Design a binder for this molecule. Structure first.
Ligand code: CDL
Ligand code: CDL
Ligand code: K
Ligand code: K
Ligand code: K
Ligand code: K
Ligand code: K
Ligand code: K
Ligand code: K
Lengths: 557, 27, 675, 190
């Protein structure tokens, strides 16, 4: 079984690499503001009609563009979810959503979080999940890729004062990456069994007599772009575990590959845009080593499983509680750690019903920041937040001015790097403290003992980290939970995006040093180990007090 | 919640504000 | 050294800056100060009886946090006291005697009794035997033995000849002999010694951008740890009784990077101390670090090959003149050349070919210097009519006395001109004795100095600009991998701005005023103490040992400071895993008895583990004060190897040395039976 | 103002090109190409429907095959609130639930074994599940054989025929259907 896990990890990584390396040659093309082969005429007849000026703009106007687009998306989604009864495609005639749930869902879907505090098939109409939810599942990923494109342009541009044009950036990125691969994935899901029919809710009389009722709708169309990027909000309450969403193991493999496709291709594009593939394979190795170590510990914990099952008369002791049937223990464990490593938020196995050691690791890889392929677009700049600190410490050990890829790094972006790193644990710990100084938050408990505090910590980490994955025992339908998670979501997205854009604006002006004989090579195993040590050091030194009273306490129970 | 912890919360916020002020400042 | 036991009592008195006015400048330890005051008032009310408990635990925590603050301020104050001791060693006595001013500049003029603290620019002062220079300036005429041990550590009686390559003097140094005049250049209080003493005494120490960025990361880390240990209270209150405030404060102070937070000032105060101890006066730590980041070094040959004008002699080639007759000519020249440079040429010729046939007693040679109209020797007492002059000088001598000159001297001058050296000719009688070869020699160990520079990966460019052939030869027996022949000031500015515009950092170690604009345009500027005054203000740092390759020591110390601070902050961060392993199972043993399997150290009690952690936090600071004073040992290694060495030492010291420290301190506490 | 027209223009274009035509394009491809799987993967005879090939239904009965238990809120195997079980690994309530389930399964099956398959007593992740592992299906062969008067070898080859193996062994699990298998059992009976 350990050998089965070994081949699973190995072949998953090989298929991910061979599907992500060709996308790097083509994402670096998008970074370089070079049109893809076969769309120059379409681009020039499209942007003139759209009014997107070809002139470039600096970091302030780029950030203002992204934040204005996100505010408009939040307003449109909020005023669509507050209605949905004045709007068509409501076969069951679902009522209008409450203000708190509408605000929380709107901010979760716009700020790349996709946290479901409800049951989708019994609370949302077809029109919401077909148009309003799907456009945010597209544009949140587009905004993340635009932020990282601005950062990569800042790193690769010598002394220019502009980071490109955001409107043409998201337009090109969306229409030539996020749409057609989503078509391919969606048609594969229709091939394998995921439904997309727009039919009314079709009642079924079973072979016994208990009249159940099946849900329908545009499920696979939302599924495809929910897996592409790192969106991770499903059609139903059991997101990416319903048989109508990912019916089989080939679909689940496509789920996994679509989760890791965009951050790995972004790392490859970062390697190939500098002319030095070592600079990208450094980040890929640094992510993958932590990834495979955490996969190994999660699979080992879940194979050890529940000890009480053997004493209660079962043939095995693997933790099948809260796990699917056609997806094995190892496969669901790998999907759990992939989901909570890449900030996706789609869960096969219910993460709440895990062994303590297998449930600590998702909490850990969330709370260290979405760095291990973490998030669409975020997977590179959240790691750059730690790279700009690791290279600072390395330059301090050398005894020279700290520089990464030639450009000098100083106080004017050390302030922004420090602020952007500490804005995440601030939100996580403040929200987890506020949820237990109030009767609400402490009263939405499903499991007693340390697992309940683990549930609250997982929920606030998922809100602040733009993950969306849930210990689903928490009843977060209360207005206090909705408002708290909304605030955490908002600050955890736009207190990271803003300092990253400020770092990009400060870095694009500085002239890049060409080369020197004596600078530290930021590609070798020493720098990979230093970056890994930094990630496992800060991000664990923050939450070992937070993790000791939950999963560690119930593991040592 | 009750009295005696509001002073701790206020002092923690004051320390955080002072530390953020020192972070932004280049003293 | 570390503890001389002279001023330790005074600096321990100066530790008491515990008031909030002198503590908020370091926030990473102002948090420690506020936590110490908070746990102290908790202990006071705890013993008074507001809340029930032992209060000895809280009293010990409060005392030990105050002890951590006291040794942090003790490290800072001891570094400051060492800086003050260095400043007082460099002090001398600035105002020691009245100035012997002259109303009119002339040797043997109207004396004055003016004090030595109001002399203005362009003031002439007479200096007799057994005297001392009041203020810095330059000489005009004369010169003799001058010792500078009391200022620079060099007891060598370096002369101060009028004009030439060195003519500038520094105040406050002993004079051994007579015949010294000095023209004042800058006012008292405008000199770099007084400026260094003022900035040490003022102790402002405007922090480098690297220091500010490291402080920013320390602030971010202490915000993170403050929020973790502050939000730890509701999490503990959820399950059973909450953890007490004293344990939270002690855990917070343990997690705060206290060691580097205390030694951040010392790393840099000891940097200034090692500047002053390396005979270098440095203005700013930013300049020190930029000098530590030098990749390209610049020099001139006027300070390398015997400091110029004292070139050696090479066999004295001549046409039709035998070697023994050339040696006789060298002997006759040794009975002449009463100038100091001429006597240098005399002793070089004598050590080239010793001859003891006749001396100054057997041949009573007239000791007269050259004549200003023709650069001619006035000696005629020998059998041959002696003339010591250049080519034009000896031509004028030919049509003054001998009539017409042959073409042999012309073609010999042409051969010397195409071979280099100097065209000065020694002539005795009516026949020339050959043009003396005066090719220079590279004095000192500058070859291995440049080898060390190349090993450290610093470019060495040699800029004088005489001709391409002799520059190639000077590079060949010097060690610079390139040079710049046909050098002009505009070419120097163009080359230095091209190097600064190509993505490299530069440094100049010039002496003159002609290259002073380029030296001031350089982002790293090393001024020559033997160099010109205006260049000395134009510089950023000045070296007082008259060594062109003092920059290697400047690079060593400047890199040592950054390496020390980065290594110490990495060690302080890496200790926190062990501090978790010591505190958290003990901190939560009361309300989470299942967590008592995490203390792998097998510590005694929860009331002892926290004391052991805080005691280790204080003792690691007081043990790393010597590491703050003396920097991390620099070895000439590449970046990857040196980063690996720094990791293998200090990152491995983290997570391993705190294990031993906490375990040994807990063992000592159990042996003493205090807990 | 500064860029209000490009912002609103790209918002309307991105909305109309991602939500509104992309679901429409995928749907008009789905019903044109793969209509059974696109329209719910329903299984039916005549006009009435007996379920899909993916959902799974509550099967209370000795004759019928039994799938994994469901932790759906208001009714077991109800496709309205697919939430699964969120009980902790150390929950005593979970311990009582698993003890009750294993006692009920031991009372139901008196001939196979005392070590029940783990998935037959542990709830599914989605709250509804149409499939179980073939050894767990073979565990309840004596019960269905006694309740239907059918051969053990015949039932074994039937569930081997109605299995579902993945493309490669390690990527998922070999697994057999439940509702479709029970419908095949009913058609075999009559
Ligand atoms: C417990 C067991 C494990 C213990 C530790 C053992 C560690 C080794 C494990 C395997 C990792 C090998 C990864 C590459 C080797 C490093 C060399 C290098 O410079 O990399 C660039 C490498 C070759 O560089 P190059 O030779 O200098 O060529 C220059 C080109 O510009 C670069 O472009 P190019 O060469 O891709 O372009 C040409 C390419 C055309 O392009 C393509 O075809 C697409 C991209 C190539 C993908 C093919 C390989 C994918 C690499 C991922 C490997 C994952 C395996 C999982 C590990 C096991 C799980 C524990 O055609 C080829 O020639 C493709 C072959 C590439 C040669 C090197 C790959 C070795 C084969 C992988 C091993 C087989 C797995 C079996 C199990 C391993 C157990 C020992 O290029 C790539 O393969 C690109 C993707 C890799 C980038 C980094 C990804 C991180 C992977 C880490 C894995 C997880 C950690 C390991 C376990 C940790 C402890 C538990
Ligand atoms: C601090 C406490 C402990 C102290 C330890 C200090 C350091 C450990 C040194 C141990 C041994 C000393 C002597 C070794 C020297 C000779 C070996 C050599 O050639 O150089 C290798 C390397 C030095 O690299 P370099 O001199 O920069 O470049 C020379 C390269 O050969 C040329 O560069 P390249 O890129 O062309 O490399 C060629 C080849 C690699 O060729 C080699 O040299 C390796 C030999 C393998 C044969 C080639 C097969 C290709 C496969 C790729 C490499 C596989 C290695 C293992 C993979 C599984 C990963 C577990 O790889 C590739 O083809 C390119 C792929 C990109 C790099 C591969 C990344 C591998 C992962 C390395 C370990 C990461 C996990 C460590 C966890 C740390 C957390 C605790 O020396 C090491 O062994 C270092 C490894 C790092 C260990 C951990 C570092 C400790 C840091 C943690 C704490 C951080 C503090 C946090 C700061 C505070 C936060 C607030
Ligand atoms: K997400
Ligand atoms: K972050
Ligand atoms: K963080
Ligand atoms: K993030
Ligand atoms: K979820
Ligand atoms: K940090
Ligand atoms: K410490």
């Amino acid at each position: 079984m350990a050998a089965q896990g070994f081949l699973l990890i190995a072949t998953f990584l090989l298929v991910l690499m061979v599907l992500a390396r060709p996308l790097g040659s083509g994402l670096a093309r998008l970074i370089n503001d070079i049109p893809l082969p076969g769309t120059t005429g379409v681009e020039r007849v499209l942007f003139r009609a759209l009014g997107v000026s070809d002139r470039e703009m600096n970091w302030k106007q780029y950030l203002c563009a992204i934040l204005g687009l996100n505010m408009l998306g939040l307003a449109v989604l909020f005023f669509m979810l507050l209605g949905q009864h004045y709007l068509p495609l409501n076969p069951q005639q679902l009522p209008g959503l409450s203000w708190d749930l509408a605000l929380n869902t709107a901010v979760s879907f716009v700020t790349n979080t996709n946290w479901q505090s409800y049951s989708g098939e019994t609370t949302l109409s077809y029109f919401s999940q077909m148009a309003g939810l799907t456009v945010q599942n597209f544009l949140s990923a587009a905004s993340g890729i635009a932020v990282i494109f601005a950062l990569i342009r800042a790193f690769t541009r010598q002394s220019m004062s502009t980071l490109g044009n955001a409107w043409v950036d998201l337009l090109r990125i969306t229409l030539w990456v996020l749409v057609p691969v989503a078509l391919l994935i969606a048609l594969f899901f229709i091939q394998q069994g995921a439904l997309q029919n727009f039919l009314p809710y079709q009642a079924v009389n079973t072979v016994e007599g208990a009249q159940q009722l099946l849900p329908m709708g545009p499920v696979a169309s939302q599924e495809a772009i929910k897996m592409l990027g790192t969106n991770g909000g499903g059609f139903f309450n059991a997101n990416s575990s319903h048989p109508f969403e990912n019916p089989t193991a080939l679909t689940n493999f496509v789920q996994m590959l679509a989760i890791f496709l965009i951050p790995t291709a972004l790392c490859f594009a970062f390697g190939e845009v500098m002319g030095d593939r070592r600079q990208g394979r450094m980040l890929l190795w640094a992510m993958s080593v932590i990834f495979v170590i955490c996969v190994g510990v999660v699979m080992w914990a879940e194979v050890q499983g529940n000890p009480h099952l053997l004493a209660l008369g079962t043939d095995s002791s693997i933790n099948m509680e809260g796990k699917e049937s056609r997806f094995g223990v190892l496969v669901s464990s790998l999907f759990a750690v992939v989901t909570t490593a890449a900030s996706c938020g789609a869960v096969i196995a219910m993460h709440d019903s895990f062994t303590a050691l297998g449930g600590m690791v998702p909490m850990w890889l969330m709370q260290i920041g979405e760095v291990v392929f973490g998030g669409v677009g975020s997977g590179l700049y959240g790691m750059m937040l730690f790279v700009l600190l690791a290279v600072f410490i390395a330059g301090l050990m050398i005894g020279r001015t700290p520089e990464y890829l030639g450009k000098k790094i100083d106080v004017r972006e050390m302030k922004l790097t420090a602020l952007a790193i500490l804005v995440t644990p601030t939100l996580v710990l403040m929200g987890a403290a506020l949820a237990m100084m109030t009767d609400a938050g402490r009263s939405a408990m499903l499991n007693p003992g340390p697992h309940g505090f683990s549930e609250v910590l997982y929920a606030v980490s998922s809100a602040a980290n733009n993950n969306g994955s849930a210990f689903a025992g928490l009843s977060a339908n209360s207005p206090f939970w909705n408002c708290l998670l909304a605030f955490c979501m908002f600050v955890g997205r736009f207190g990271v995006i803003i300092p990253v854009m400020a770092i990009a604006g400060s870095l694009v002006s500085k002239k890049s040093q060409a080369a020197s004989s004596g600078t530290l090579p930021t590609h070798g195993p020493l720098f990979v180990g230093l970056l890994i040590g930094t990630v496992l050091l800060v991000g664990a030194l923050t939450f070992i007090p937070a993790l000791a009273l939950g999963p560690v306490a119930e593991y040592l129970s | 919640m009750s009295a005696g912890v509001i002073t701790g919360v206020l002092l923690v916020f004051l320390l955080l504000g002072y530390l953020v002020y020192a972070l932004i400042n280049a003293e | 050294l570390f503890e001389p036991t002279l001023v330790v009592q005074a600096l321990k008195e100066a530790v008491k800056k515990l008031n909030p006015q002198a503590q908020w400048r370091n926030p990473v330890m102002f948090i420690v100060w506020i936590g110490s005051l908070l746990t102290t008032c908790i202990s006071i009310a705890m013993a008074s009886g507001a809340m029930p408990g032992n209060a000895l635990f809280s009293a010990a925590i409060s005392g030990w946090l105050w002890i951590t603050v006291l040794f942090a301020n003790f490290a800072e104050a001891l570094a400051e006291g060492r800086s003050k001791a260095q400043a007082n060693s460099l002090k001398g006595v600035k105002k020691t005697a009245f100035a012997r001013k002259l109303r009119e500049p002339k040797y043997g003029a109207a004396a004055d009794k003016v004090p030595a603290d109001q002399l203005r620019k362009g003031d002439i002062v007479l200096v007799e035997a057994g005297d001392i220079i009041p203020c810095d300036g330059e000489v005009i005429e004369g010169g003799a033995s001058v010792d500078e041990s009391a200022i620079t550590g060099e007891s060598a009686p370096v002369i101060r000849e009028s004009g030439g390559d060195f003519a500038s003097v520094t105040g406050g140094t002993r004079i051994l002999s007579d015949w010294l005049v000095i023209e004042c250049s800058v006012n008292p209080g405008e000199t770099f010694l007084d400026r260094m003493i003022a900035m040490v005494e003022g102790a402002q120490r405007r922090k480098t951008p690297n220091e500010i960025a490291l402080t920013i990361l320390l602030i971010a880390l202490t915000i993170v740890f403050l929020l973790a240990t502050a939000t730890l209270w509701p999490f503990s209150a959820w399950g059973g009784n909450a953890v007490s405030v004293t344990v939270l404060v002690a855990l917070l102070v343990c997690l705060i990077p206290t060691t580097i937070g205390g030694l951040l000032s010392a790393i840099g105060v000891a940097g200034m101390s090692r500047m002053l101890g390396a005979n270098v006066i440095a203005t700013s730590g930013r300049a020190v670090e930029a000098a530590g980041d030098v990749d390209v070094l610049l020099l001139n040959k006027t300070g390398t090959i015997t400091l110029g004008n004292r070139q050696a002699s090479e066999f004295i080639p001549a046409q039709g003149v035998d070697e023994k007759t050339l040696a006789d000519a060298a002997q006759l020249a040794s009975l002449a050349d009463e100038t100091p440079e001429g006597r240098s040429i005399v002793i070089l010729a004598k050590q080239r070919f010793n001859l003891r046939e006749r001396d100054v007693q057997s041949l009573h040679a007239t000791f007269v210097p050259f004549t200003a109209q023709s650069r001619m020797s006035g000696i005629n007492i020998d059998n041959r009519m002696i003339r010591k002059g250049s080519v034009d000088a000896i031509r004028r001598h030919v049509e003054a006395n001998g009539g017409h000159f042959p073409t042999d001297v012309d073609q010999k001058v042409d051969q010397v001109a195409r071979q280099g050296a100097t065209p000065l000719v020694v002539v005795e009688g009516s026949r020339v004795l050959g043009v003396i070869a005066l090719k220079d020699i590279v004095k000192g160990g500058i070859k291995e100095r440049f080898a060390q520079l190349r090993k450290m990966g610093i470019k060495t460019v040699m800029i004088t600009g005489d001709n391409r052939l002799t520059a190639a030869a000077i590079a060949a027996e010097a060690g610079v991998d390139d040079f710049l022949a046909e050098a002009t000031p505009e070419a120097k500015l163009a080359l230095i701005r091209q190097y600064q515009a190509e993505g490299r950092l530069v440094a100049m170690t010039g002496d003159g005023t002609n290259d002073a604009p380029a030296l001031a345009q350089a982002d790293v500027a090393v001024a020559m103490n033997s160099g010109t005054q205006a260049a000395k203000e134009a510089g950023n740092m000045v070296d007082l040992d008259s060594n062109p390759t003092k920059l290697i020591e400047v690079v060593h110390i400047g890199k040592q400071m950054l390496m020390t601070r980065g290594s110490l902050t990495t060690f302080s961060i890496a200790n926190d895993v062990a501090k978790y392993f010591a505190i958290i199972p003990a901190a939560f043993a009361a309300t989470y008895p299942q967590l008592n399997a995490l203390n792998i150290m097998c510590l005694h009690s929860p009331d002892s583990a926290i004391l052991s952690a805080v005691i280790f936090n204080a003792l690691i600071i007081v043990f790393l004060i010597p590491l703050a004073l003396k920097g991390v040992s620099y070895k000439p290694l590449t970046a990857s190897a040196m980063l690996r060495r720094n990791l293998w030492i200090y990152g491995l010291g983290g997570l391993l040395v705190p294990f031993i420290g906490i375990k040994v301190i807990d063992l000592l506490l159990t042996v003493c039976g205090l807990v | 103002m500064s860029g209000l027209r490009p912002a609103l223009s790209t918002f309307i274009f991105l909305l109309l090109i991602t939500g509104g035509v992309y679901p429409l394009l995928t749907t008009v491809l789905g019903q044109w190409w793969f209509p059974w799987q696109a329209n719910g993967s329903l299984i039916r005879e005549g006009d009435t429907v007996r379920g899909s090939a993916l959902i799974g239904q509550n099967f209370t009965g000795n004759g019928y095959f039994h799938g994994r238990p469901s932790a759906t809120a208001e009714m077991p195997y109800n496709p309205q609130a697919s939430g699964g079980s969120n009980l902790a690994v150390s929950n005593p309530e979970l311990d009582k639930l698993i003890a009750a389930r294993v006692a009920a399964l031991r009372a139901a099956n008196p001939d196979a074994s005392a070590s029940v398959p783990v998935e037959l007593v542990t709830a599914s992740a989605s709250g509804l599940d149409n499939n179980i592992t073939p050894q767990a299906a073979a565990w309840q062969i004596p019960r269905v054989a006694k309740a239907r008067n059918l051969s053990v070898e015949q039932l074994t080859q039937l569930i081997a025929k109605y299995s579902q193996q993945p493309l490669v062994k390690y990527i998922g699990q070999p697994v057999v259907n439940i509702v479709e298998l029970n419908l095949a059992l009913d058609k075999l009976d009559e």
